[PDB]
């Protein structure tokens, strides 16, 4: 906690590693003063810095990072987008829901996982139908995370969809739905 | 919490997804009754079940899972080993230190990351020299996680090594060491 301004100041250092390490440290410390300088490091030249900055903003958890993080979901770098999604998941703000639904169709499997995870944490039923679609994703971990997110959301929209999948679905989606029906009253 | 025995019982179900979902749920619930049945699911036929079981044991955090998890660091499946390492990191027990040092040389990049992370969390200085070596890993995320773990460990063995790297090291290891010297008194 004593080193918060030293690390804020290191977000301007010429060395990418010093900037990255500063963002990482500021996420762990959790002091709110770091929020605006981290928002700025979401446009850093170096992708590792942008990743660490998103990560740190999620850890601090201040809603002021929501709109900048939503933008960072369009970053050229896959791991930045992944970090932004996890961070929006951690903050829990419903404004991320539609942008994260889009990121469920991201070309990188690791981004789609993070998008599903985050939708599950936010808990908003608009995500239900897009998560049912992700049950057919070519990546196994994506499918799985969409199933977990469906369970976390819950409620009557999830129940009704799981009845239909248990009835006519195939493959993984079927197994998900049947587990659902066995494990709820 | 009401469903703990239902999910324990589902660890014997014929469907791999029902067993996997049960392990996942039992990790979230956190009831100690789940520990021995999860230890057993670390030898499940299906790799997703073994992964979820390790993950859940780390979340519950009971030291009784330490020796079974150490064994699971030799699993044929890369993601099981990864999960076992993260879990040993979360439990924090020093008995994992030597097995995790070995897993820093794992053939999968994701395992080496998890091994570095876990050593950093356990905080034991036997890891210092092997983590300095990981600064030369071909994977960028591995190197980074080894640098973070060095910072988390700290103390005089880390200080002395970072002085030498700042003096004669090259590339990433150099940048790590110099950041170290700039950020400590």
Numbering used by the authors:
A (entry chain A), B (entry chain A): 18 to 202
Can you quote the paper on this entry?
In this paper, we propose a new design of a multi-domain protein switch based on an open/closed bivalve-shell-like protein and we describe the experimental behavior of the resulting bidomain protein based on this design. Each protein member of the αRep library has the same general architecture but is endowed with a unique binding surface made by the juxtaposition of hypervariable residues. In the dimeric structure, the binding concave surfaces made from the variable residues from each monomer face each other and the dimer resembles a closed bivalve shell.
A3_A3 crystallizes with one A3 subunit in the asymmetric unit. The hydrodynamic radius of the bidomain A3_A3 (3.0 nm) is similar to the dimeric A3 (2.9 nm) indicating that the chimeric bidomain protein also adopts a closed bivalve conformation. This was expected for A3_A3: when not linked together the two A3 monomers dimerize with relatively high affinity (KD A3/A3 = 37 nM, ultra-centrifugation data), and in the A3_A3 bidomain, their mutual interactions are further stabilized by their proximity. However, the KD value of bA3-2 binding on A3_A3 (37 ± 6 nM) is higher than with A3 alone (without linker: 4.5 ± 7 nM), suggesting that the intramolecular link between the two binding sites stabilizes the closed form and induces a lower apparent affinity for an external ligand. This is particularly clear for the A3_A3 protein, which still binds its ligand although with an apparent lower affinity than A3.
